RNA sequence: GCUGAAAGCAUCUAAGCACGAAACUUGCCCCGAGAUGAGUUCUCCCUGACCCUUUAAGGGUCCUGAAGGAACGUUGAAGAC
RNA sequence: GCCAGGCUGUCUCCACCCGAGACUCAGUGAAAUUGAACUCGCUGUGAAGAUGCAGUGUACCCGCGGCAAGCUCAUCACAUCCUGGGGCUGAAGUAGGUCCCAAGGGUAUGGCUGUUCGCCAUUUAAAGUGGUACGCGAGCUGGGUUUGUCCCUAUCUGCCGUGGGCGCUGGAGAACUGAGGGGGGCUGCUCCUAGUACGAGA
RNA sequence: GUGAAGAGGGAAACAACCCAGACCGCCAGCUAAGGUCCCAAAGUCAUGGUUAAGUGGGAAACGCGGAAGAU
């Protein structure tokens, strides 16, 4: 229903009972804690800033420590935005599970593709450039399997990023 | 010009108010308001409505005539109302009506639904006949035109939606 | 599979022995052709009264692919070579009533309902 | 295309006054505040002293060295550097 | 001197690997050229394509990596070949003929030429007309013509990616709205409607 | 007549288009061509008319049309 940030773990084919095994990419989506709520009155638009995971005590800067303390959430390795669906805002310190995607059947996956080395002139312009490590959103991906008690998501096809790469899954607005 | 020189008789039960250039007419059906062009002057003229072109406007006469015609139509509407009848010629052309939406099927793979503006009542004495009642001629005419545009009168059989007082022409291939 | 100037085998009693691809259809400016695809082939060698004479131009369909084709269950059924059977634009029913070798189960198309009957070996 | 003349007819318009082509733009997604117009939100740190001058977007001296970064090591599905 | 056959990434399409360069580290280090350079695009003029003249727009300062504009690669107008809509039609419908608009997108493979062009076969929706010195030789084979090393540090302008310094007004760590820019927007077949409306029938 | 061998102002730039022949200097004024909405210094100046199309701000012959012009 709303976008959730997770981590890519792997991709395989889930053998169906009818021998139609489908390519499934595996995303671990821990309970994302809503760190802050961006509203029209203060931030000028409706959205929620959320985190997830854990940060080492040395890795947490004191400004970040205070930000998390105000948010009342465990220090997560990264922070991300999520635009609301103009339905309703969330409360500070709220943890979002994966049940929201349990009844969507269509999601879009945004992530950074695996980095590639020096892309010469022929590879880029056919100056030189680079490919990979770019935030792109592949759309029209249908969720295959959802396991809330295991925080496991299987999504059809392939998604940018290698094992352990952070990514986002949002409702399939485009059809 | 000629049409303008014709005060329109307002029957009993119709109230006319001239607020500057605005004309507000009330009757049995309901309220109506209409901002009149400044090129013509309209006075109460109890039991009538006299129009006088304003000096300094070359288009005064035609403007006054059009305003007189519109006020006459509004008076006739509010006092008794306007009725329009539409027939659906062709096999399988249904005119189901429910709520404030008219649903039609004129050979399309999907139903064609038209919304009814407020103050317009649709009735179906017969499934293939649809009657619209409205206080304003413009609204009833617009809804009827929207219904007719869904299926143009086919000029080989005269099918589709047609008006009761409208003649529909039809033709056939000459030789081949 | 098929590419430009591909060498195809023969799996019918039409008399063809060596059939060579000339053009690829089923898509404008297409590159290759698949098992369930229509291909353009001509004949190189014919029996004394072979149904196909050198330089013939008529359609055909590949029944077996050397590269192999996939299945929904992951099966990658593959054959020792490329086998193709000739087809005609009109009277699609091929002359050959016998097909050498087994055939896969992807021939359930609308026009391939009459070929599944043949090829007793699966 | 609903009423409709001027110009007792008529008419896409003069008054009231409606739809609509893949043609154009949003809508699909990516970069983007070096956007000098330099933007918005959250959080954290500094709460000393003295002297002089051309006496104010002033200067100098002793102490202090907060958060953060960089400095170096392991290095990476990050990289020519 | 000719023919038939087998024979490899020459190619459809190229994918990875092995050794030396290409990049950095510590040291050696010369060049052609050089009047001086705070060395932008477009429109117009100019001994005639202007980094320097009139008008206008953009761009923080300085580094590292080269395709090279100074057959491959593209760009711009419609004065439209198609995708095409809309008027007229000697338009019953498909299919068409003329005209107005539309450049968003596409606009081939072989045999003779060195060939632009030109002729024939095979397909598509078309295999378009022109400007860029038929655009492109300090990019590439010289095939004819017209000096067969196809010469002249890619020195410097322009070009993308990524960096060092600096300001957003005390400093710093994070999440972003967004002025604007970029990419592509193609298309065949079958099924229900339906062998239906329409159509004398076809 | 000009340049050649005459500067300078104007025509947006410009040597042959108009005005105008620089002894040097001074932070004064008046004129020639050209301008007096601004860029850029001057009247958003007075009166009598054309203009509804940006024709002005490019175009002949011909019955306002003719009219199609350069990233």
Residue numbers in the entry:
A (entry chain D): 1 to 126, 161 to 209
B (entry chain G): 1 to 176
C (entry chain K): 1 to 122
From the paper:
The proline-rich antimicrobial designer peptide Api137 inhibits protein expression in bacteria by binding simultaneously to the ribosomal polypeptide exit tunnel and the release factor (RF), depleting the cellular RF pool and leading to ribosomal arrest at stop codons. Separation of cellular extracts derived from cells exposed to Api137 in a sucrose gradient reveals elevated levels of partially assembled and not fully matured precursors of the 50S subunit (pre-50S). These data suggest a second mechanism for Api137, wherein it disrupts 50S subunit assembly by inducing the formation of misfolded precursor particles potentially incapable of evolving into active ribosomes, suggesting a bactericidal mechanism.
Notably, another precursor, C_(L29)-/(L22)-, displayed a complete core but lacked densities for uL22, uL29, bL23 (positioned adjacent to uL29), and bL32 (positioned adjacent to uL22), indicating that domain III can form and is at least partially stabilized even without uL22 and uL29. Furthermore, domain II helix H34, which serves as the foundation for positioning domain IV helices H64 to H67 during subsequent assembly, was consistently docked in all but two precursors (states d126_(L29)-/(L22)- & C_(L29)-/(L22)-). The absence of helix H34 was observed only in precursors that also lacked uL29 and bL23, indicating that these proteins are necessary for the proper formation of these critical regions in domains II and IV regions. Additional misorientation of domain IV regions was observed in nearly half of these cases, resulting in an overall frequency of 18.1% for the ~H61 states. In contrast, the absence of uL29 was observed only in the earliest precursor states, representing 5.1% of all precursors.
